[PDB]
């Protein structure tokens, strides 16, 4: 077992050749059983026994989360205003590739690195020729994910340079942490939405002499993660009045939380860059040779994971966004264009992937940074 170099280059598995990877923050489930605590499963009964039955699955999440932690520390180390996010995304992606030692689909990037600026919320990454220099008075949402054998971990944070945004950052961080602690086994999603809205709205923001009230973006919400499936079909809300579905043992969730000094809703603003093949659709005929070729290329290289046009240009494929929209109309791939708020507004996001262990709740994405 060796150690990591100052510019992170050693693969995570090389740092832990034993096979066991650092555990996330273990937390007992909330005492939502009418006062009765859940500190009765931590004892090594059959609960722990069947927890051990899925130990190998967890280790993949652990290594992915560790890789995410090192990558985000590296990004925090050198990120600064004045440099465009094309090279920022290139650096983040290449560092993550080296740290995860990607090989086909057994390991690699779960989805393109999102870097949303100002009113933009999510699902934005620069395309080819995108000349956007960063500014001192900017806020950015760095959302990126890594996976091991399809065990996806999703985490996101917000970077700021002007110290006028710390109130909004702390509000969104508190909302995300409250959603984290509120989540548990056999709890309704409407409850977590209740908690998130009741913690996050009780904050006030003073920006540029104007006092705003921070509100959730009712359009976005958290999601459940599946095997090579970023969205398993369950969405945890961040506003009041949602579904009454429960969370069950053995599932993983991404507890996202967005806060804006705007209208609390988002729409499609600029050119789409994120794309995702549908996990549920089967075989749909195609009539264009270029479209067929692009489809088989993407299903070989990106499978069901999300991809961006940069990842296709990185593969040497050109003249392809045509067949790409063709797959979009055919329903094979669903575009995910950037979501943006009103101009002049600001948005902050913090995200963590949580594990519902039989004995406890592990937030594998937890780090010392946040």
């Amino acid at each position: 077992p060796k150690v990591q170099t100052d510019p992170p280059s050693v693969p995570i598995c090389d740092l832990y050749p034993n096979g066991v990877f650092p555990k996330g923050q273990e937390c007992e489930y909330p005492p939502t059983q009418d006062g009765r605590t859940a500190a009765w499963r931590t004892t090594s009964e059959e609960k722990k026994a069947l927890d051990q039955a899925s130990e190998e699955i967890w280790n993949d999440f652990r290594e992915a989360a560790e890789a995410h932690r090192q990558v985000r520390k590296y990004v925090m180390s050198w990120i600064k205003p004045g440099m465009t996010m094309i090279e920022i995304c290139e650096k983040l992606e290449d560092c993550s590739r080296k740290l995860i030692k990607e090989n086909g689909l057994n390991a690699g990037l779960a989805f393109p690195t999102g870097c949303s600026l100002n009113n933009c919320a999510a699902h934005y990454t620069p395309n080819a020729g995108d000349t956007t220099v960063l500014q001192y008075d900017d806020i950015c949402k760095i959302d990126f994910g890594t996976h091991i054998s399809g065990r996806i971990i999703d985490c996101a944070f917000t970077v700021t340079f002007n110290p006028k945004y710390d109130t909004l950052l702390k509000a969104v961080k508190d909302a995300t942490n409250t959603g984290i602690k509120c989540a548990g086994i056999d709890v309704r999603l409407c409850d977590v939405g209740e908690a998130i809205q009741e913690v996050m709205e009780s904050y006030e923001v003073e920006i540029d002499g104007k006092t705003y009230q921070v509100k959730p973006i009712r359009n976005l919400n958290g999601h459940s993660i599946g095997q090579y499936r970023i969205h398993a079909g369950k969405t945890v809300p961040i506003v009041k009045g949602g579904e009454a579905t429960r969370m069950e043992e053995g599932e993983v969730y991404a507890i996202e939380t967005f806060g804006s000094t705007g209208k609390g809703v988002v729409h499609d603003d600029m050119e789409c860059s994120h794309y995702m093949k549908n996990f549920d659709v089967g075989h749909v005929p195609i009539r264009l040779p270029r479209t067929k070729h692009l489809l088989n290329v993407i299903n070989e290289n990106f499978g069901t994971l999300a991809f961006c046009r940069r990842w296709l240009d990185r593969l040497g494929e050109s003249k392809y966004l045509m067949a790409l929209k063709n797959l979009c109309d055919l329903g094979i791939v669903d575009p995910y264009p950037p979501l943006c708020d009103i101009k002049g507004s600001y948005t902050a996001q913090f995200e963590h992937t949580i594990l519902l262990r039989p004995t406890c709740k592990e937030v594998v994405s937890r780090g010392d940074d946040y």
């Binding site: 009712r218 506003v239 009041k240 009045g241 949602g242």
Partner: protein, 129 residues
């Protein structure tokens, strides 16, 4: 009693012009009274509403002592929106409630170049009388 032969008192005629009025006219009917403190200091009784004025509700279910600011002047529906004049939608969102400008009181004006000229023009007409 009205004596002008060229001004009508017909019910249907007056209603038609009020319901079918251009927005720049509609701003004139979009008028609200100033509070006693502005009225005494500016010597002006009523002023057209604007997008950002401190406004107090004096009639309706939302009548109270709190001060709010206009956020939208919906001239089509002859209503305006304040922050805390909201009600709870069924699904969970929150929507504004339209309040007619004649049922509020302006507690602070959007002091502006055109605005500043508007008060003194009305005020200087008072010392004429």
């Amino acid at each position: 009693m009205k004596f002008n032969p060229f001004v009508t008192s017909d019910r249907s005629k007056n209603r038609k012009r009020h319901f079918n009025a251009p927005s720049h006219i509609r701003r004139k009917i979009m008028s609200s009274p100033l509070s006693k403190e502005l009225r005494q200091k500016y010597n002006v009784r009523s002023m057209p509403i604007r997008k950002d004025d401190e406004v107090q509700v004096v009639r309706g279910h939302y009548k109270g002592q709190q001060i709010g600011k206009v956020v939208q002047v919906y001239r089509k529906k002859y209503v305006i929106y304040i922050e805390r004049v909201q009600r709870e939608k069924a699904n969970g969102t929150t929507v504004h409630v339209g309040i007619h400008p004649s049922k509020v009181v302006i507690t602070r004006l959007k002091l502006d170049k055109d605005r500043k000229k508007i008060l003194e023009r009305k005020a200087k007409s008072r010392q004429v009388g």
